[PDB]
Amino acid sequence: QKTPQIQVYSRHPPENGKPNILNCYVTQFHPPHIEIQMLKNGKKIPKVEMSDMSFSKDWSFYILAHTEFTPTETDTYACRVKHDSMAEPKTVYWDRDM
């Protein structure tokens, strides 16, 4: 059981009111079965694109989840990951500074 590492970040440098792509990059996990959700203000985003699953030289699996989004001063975005290695789902918020 390998614990997933998560990064939540935009494809392009963010600007409030400008359409962008929000990424949720999940790595270093095993087994390959995983559940990934993307959230806007705590609510599930319906259209989420998932890359095909791949694995790294250390055998661990990785996947990229993404969705269109328009950053604003008030809206919050997060990625919630459920995996066998974790007692509880892990939620990482998007932070424009990272």
């Binding site: 390998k2 590492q5 699953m53 055998w59 990229l64």
Partner: protein, 277 residues
């Protein structure tokens, strides 16, 4: 520079089904170029790089037939390992393989490569000699003995030094325009002030290809050890990569710090500092 080809294979057993899910991914110079997935409507190896579209129907048919063989190889190997470890098919189990070859800048073979993992842990590997095996545990010793008896290593050596090298030569020539292309990082520094009269300086590198990159920080001269924060290189999702490196600096020395970005795509390394709005 150096070159490589790899096939990354995965089989995941499915409780209640005889056939596992089988996925094979091919890479040339760490870039995906082919893919086979047993879960597809009509499973077939498919091109994943534009330069592979030039391969004729016989190539795709020959690779697809190999994948059908591999599905059976993985199904039987998973069943054997289930017995070795006294496990239940009521749970899913994972078998993985990496194989291929590495070449020098002149395209001559540097090394063959072959390894296996079970449940995400090293199981058995072919040594760099391409003649002897390293078993990770007692159960893998059963496989090692079986393979020594059947002379399995000789057949892998033939592929890794022969066909692997010849096909990679063809792919490097066919994929030349795509493989040689680079995307330079665009860099910028951001300011994130904190407690104790400190401010974090973040040097960003965006939209670069390949993923290999180096970011450094300095106060006038001399590089900064350990105190620098560095995220893992991440895909932007458009074929390019991103990375950042940050430093905690006193609130009076920001314009005194410089970041450097090293990437093969750049006409020369980047040099930058925080710029006031």
């Amino acid at each position: 520079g150096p070159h490589s080809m790899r096939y990354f294979e995965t089989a995941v057993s499915r409780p209640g089904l005889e056939e596992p899910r089988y996925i094979s991914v091919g890479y040339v110079d760490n870039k995906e170029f082919v893919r086979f997935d047993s879960d597809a409507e009509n499973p077939r190896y498919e091109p994943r790089a534009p330069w592979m579209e030039q391969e004729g129907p016989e190539y795709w048919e020959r690779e697809t037939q190999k994948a059908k063989g591999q599905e059976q190889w993985f199904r039987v190997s998973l069943r054997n390992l289930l017995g070795y470890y006294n496990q239940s098919a009521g749970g899913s189990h994972t078998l993985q393989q990496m194989s291929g070859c590495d070449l020098g800048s002149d395209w001559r073979l540097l090394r063959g490569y072959l390894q296996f993992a079970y449940e995400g842990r090293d199981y058995i590997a072919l040594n760099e000699d391409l003649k002897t095996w390293t078993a990770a545990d007692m159960a893998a010793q059963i496989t090692r003995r079986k393979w020594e008896q059947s002379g399995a290593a000789e057949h892998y050596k033939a592929y890794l030094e022969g066909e692997c090298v010849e096909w990679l030569h063809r792919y490097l020539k066919n994929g030349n325009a795509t493989l040689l292309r680079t995307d330079s990082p665009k860099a910028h520094v951001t300011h994130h002030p904190r407690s104790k009269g400190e401010v974090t300086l973040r040097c960003w590198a965006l939209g670069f290809y390949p993923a290999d990159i180096t970011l450094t920080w300095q106060l006038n001269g001399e590089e900064l050890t350990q105190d620098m924060e560095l995220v893992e290189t991440r895909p932007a999702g458009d074929g390019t990569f991103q990375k950042w490196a940050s430093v905690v600096v006193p609130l009076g020395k920001e314009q005194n710090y410089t970041c450097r970005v090293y990437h093969e795509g750049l006409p020369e390394p980047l040099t930058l500092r925080w710029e006031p709005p």
